[PDB]
Amino acid sequence: YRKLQRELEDATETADAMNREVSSLKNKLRRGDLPFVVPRRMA
């Protein structure tokens, strides 16, 4: 394990911003905006 406390906390301070970024990309993929990638998991 780690040698310090709270490193995971440090690492997740911008979690909100990252969540909003992921939501944006997921939405684009869902809408079929980026057909270079599959819209849903395939074989």
Partner: protein, 93 residues
């Protein structure tokens, strides 16, 4: 399947190993997150036990404010860890 494709599936499977135990079948409550962290990510545990620290982590991850950690928030968690590992990868060649 490439190593990367398999790795992404491990992320999915590990989440549900714990998410189904209590309450919402598809989210991690405080207890389930603590289990997942302790058993699956022991390399990232703090030097000493620290409930306040864990509660703070839960709060950081709970971006939509519903008192749970859903799969997207869990991916952000894992991403944050990978980013730290990447700082190490790049910072000390």
């Amino acid at each position: 399947a490439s190593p990367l494709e398999k790795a992404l599936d491990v992320m999915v499977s590990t989440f549900h190993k714990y998410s189904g135990k209590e309450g919402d079948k598809f989210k991690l409550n405080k207890s389930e997150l603590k289990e997942l962290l302790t058993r699956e990510l022991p390399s990232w545990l703090g030097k000493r036990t620290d409930e306040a620290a864990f509660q703070k982590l839960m709060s950081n991850l709970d971006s939509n404010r519903d008192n749970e950690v859903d799969f997207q928030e869990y991916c952000v968690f894992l991403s944050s860890i990978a980013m730290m590992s990447n700082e190490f990868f790049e910072g000390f060649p």
